[PDB]
Amino acid sequence: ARQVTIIGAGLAGTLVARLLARNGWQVNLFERRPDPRIETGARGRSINLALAERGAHALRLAGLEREVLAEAVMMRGRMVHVPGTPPNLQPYGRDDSEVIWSINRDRLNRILLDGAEAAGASIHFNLGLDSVDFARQRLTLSNVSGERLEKRFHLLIGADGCNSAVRQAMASVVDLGEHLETQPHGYKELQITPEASAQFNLEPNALHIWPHGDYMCIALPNLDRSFTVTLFLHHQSPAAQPASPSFAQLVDGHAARRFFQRQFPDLSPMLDSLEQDFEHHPTGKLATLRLTTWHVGGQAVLLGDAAHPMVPFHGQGMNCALEDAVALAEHLQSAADNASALAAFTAQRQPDALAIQAMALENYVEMSSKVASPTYLLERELGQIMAQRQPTRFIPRYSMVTFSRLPYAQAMARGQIQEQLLKFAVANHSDLTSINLDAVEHEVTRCLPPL
Ligand SMILES: Cc1cc2nc3c(=O)[nH]c(=O)nc-3n(C[C@H](O)[C@H](O)[C@H](O)COP(=O)(O)OP(=O)(O)OC[C@H]3O[C@@H](n4cnc5c(N)ncnc54)[C@H](O)[C@@H]3O)c2cc1C
Ligand SMILES: O=C(Cc1nn[nH]n1)c1ccc(C2CCCCC2)cc1
Ligand SMILES: [Cl-]
Ligand SMILES: [Cl-]
């Protein structure tokens, strides 16, 4: 039996443990945190994630999809809150079967843990990886108090998150070629209670966005009708724009409140504990981390956030993580040896991780400044016409990322061609009446191969 050691019982680590264990691998999975299935007196505060086709299909192959969806809230469309008009629901894709699911992270983790153990994996909690010795094939683990334990390993999978100890240990034996790109936006999570969302008739079965240019709020629903609101806002004000809103200017809850009443006046009444949340929840940091290589020979490979931290603006990090786990399990299961498997995995997935990293950055502009401009409206309306006349050629980029399993690089490449097609068609035209539709359709057929 082939043996594998996995660091991190997060989303990618637990899924890959399930897929390998049920193929007969001996799987040991080590996790720094305690087991979240052991109930304690602490008050767990878990956020929700948007689960889409790529994540859903990976769970479907694992036999876990139905269990996960039982606990998920359907989001049928995007509820855009633009000042001056009523909130406007934009359906996802073309028909009612194209939805995103809002799923609690801790519930998903528990389901995945149960699934890995049922497939035969052994999960060891309260053991955090501290270092690796690649030449002696040993690693050092330790509990919180610092007491250390050594284990031999044969194949090591670093599924240990954006601050991966495995990636750090790989920097001893190979150049990963890391480039960290910081992001000027931080984020803060605020809460809407069920009473407040019910009192203000906030739609539960939708994803809600409050665009506002260089800042914005997003809200995902929970099963109990509460919402978690995420404010994205610059850490610091730029020197050129010294009065522009930023976190540094929101020192306490009362400034926060005046900000929301002025700039989000229909959302402010719903955030009852805006003051308290603002001061006791930490401001989070966003960053994109790109690696030229993900593995060391046949000994160790990264996946998930350990491999490609990305900004959350597409809701694709977990979706990408689950899709990585599927691909890593398939390559390991079928390769001549572990070395060939890890090379072929990195070669397949690294271009795709780059593509989704780039699309997540760009999607910030789409969500916060594009959805409210006159020019983008005309293009989106021409885009839906094109999807109807050429359905296998013109597939909107958001739809290819979110509702298909087209490799992310091909989605990006086709999206760039569509974007420039729509951009030139609508330029110097104010209405849809002055646009030659068959001209645009002819460029779809000349430039977009059918799927
Ligand atoms: C605010 C926010 C919102 C997001 N929303 C979405 C969304 O809506 N949709 C989406 O698809 N993605 C979303 N993401 C991204 C998503 O959360 C991650 O991409 C996903 O969790 C990656 O899964 P993973 O298994 O790689 O890592 P994680 O889920 O982070 O798992 C890492 C695991 O490794 C463990 N670990 C860490 N260090 C060690 C160590 N030294 N030793 C042992 N164990 C260790 C951790 O305890 C944890 O269990 C969001 C991210 C953020 C920050
Ligand atoms: O699906 C998307 C992107 C989209 N654009 N237009 N429709 N939705 C999407 C984008 C972001 C999120 C998360 C990001 C972290 C904070 C919670 C919300 C979820 C999902
Ligand atoms: Cl959309
Ligand atoms: Cl994400």
Swiss-Prot record:
Result of changing residue 363 to A: Decreases kynurenine 3-monooxygenase activity
Activity dependence on pH, as recorded: Optimum pH is 8.5.
Reactions listed under catalytic activity: L-kynurenine + NADPH + O2 + H(+) = 3-hydroxy-L-kynurenine + NADP(+) + H2O
EC top class named in words: oxidoreductase
One BP annotation, GO: quinolinate biosynthetic process
Biological pathway: Cofactor biosynthesis; NAD(+) biosynthesis; quinolinate from L-kynurenine: step 1/3; Siderophore biosynthesis; quinolobactin biosynthesis
Flavoprotein found in the keyword field: yes
Cofactor(s) listed: FAD
Consequence the record notes for mutating residue 367 to L: Decreases kynurenine 3-monooxygenase activity
Residues that, per the record, bind FAD: 11-12, 31-33, 50, 105, 129, 305, 318-319
Keywords linked to the UniProt accession: FAD, Flavoprotein, Monooxygenase, NADP, Oxidoreductase, Pyridine nucleotide biosynthesis
SUPFAM superfamilies: FAD/NAD(P)-binding domain (SSF51905)
Sequence positions that bind L-kynurenine: 78, 92, 363, 398
Known EC number: 1.14.13.9
Pfam families, A to Z: FAD_binding_3 (PF01494)
GO molecular function terms listed in the Swiss-Prot or TrEMBL record: FAD binding; kynurenine 3-monooxygenase activity; NAD(P)H oxidase H2O2-forming activity
Similarity remark: Belongs to the aromatic-ring hydroxylase family. KMO subfamily.
Purpose: Catalyzes the hydroxylation of L-kynurenine (L-Kyn) to form 3-hydroxy-L-kynurenine (L-3OHKyn). Probably required for the synthesis of quinolinic acid and the siderophore quinolobactin.
Protein name, entry field: Kynurenine 3-monooxygenase
